């Protein structure tokens, strides 16, 4: 049950830098199923346990996604709004 201060401490170090979309869920395996190419994404400072993207990235061509950090390690995964150019109209939360 971390306090807000601890959560602010935490999220400051978890800094993703690129996002890749997949036709199949990459949570089981973040390597295969890559449909797009690395697209840069930027995030603001943490606050209340939330970090939000600074700009709505535009990706060229899936129903899934997978965040990556600067050292080729996947840090998040999940499914998109709808299967199917895709516009990323996104934040990371500890709640």
């Amino acid at each position: 049950t971390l306090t807000i201060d601890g959560k602010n401490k935490i999220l400051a170090t978890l800094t993703p830098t690129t996002i890749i979309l997949h036709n199949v869920d990459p949570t089981a395996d973040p390597t295969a199923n890559k449909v797009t190419q690395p697209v840069a994404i930027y995030f603001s400072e943490p606050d209340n346990g939330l970090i939000a993207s600074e700009d709505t990235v535009n990706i060229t061509v899936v129903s899934h996604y997978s965040l990556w950090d600067a050292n080729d390690k996947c840090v998040a995964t999940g499914a998109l709004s709808k299967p199917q150019i895709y516009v990323i109209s996104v934040s990371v939360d500890l709640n």
Partner: protein
């Protein structure tokens, strides 16, 4: 797409840019562009 005002528009867009504002400097009076922070390479075309 509509001389100082065009350069000021460019300067504001650059300084509000998610990435370029971090690592590029702009000054206007004519316009000038140089390094900012660590960045080592910059080009304009």
């Amino acid at each position: 797409t509509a001389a100082e005002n065009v350069l000021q528009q460019f300067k504001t867009q650059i300084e509000a840019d998610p990435t370029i504002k971090d690592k590029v400097s702009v000054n206007v009076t004519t316009m000038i562009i140089t390094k900012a922070g660590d960045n080592d390479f910059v080009k304009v075309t």
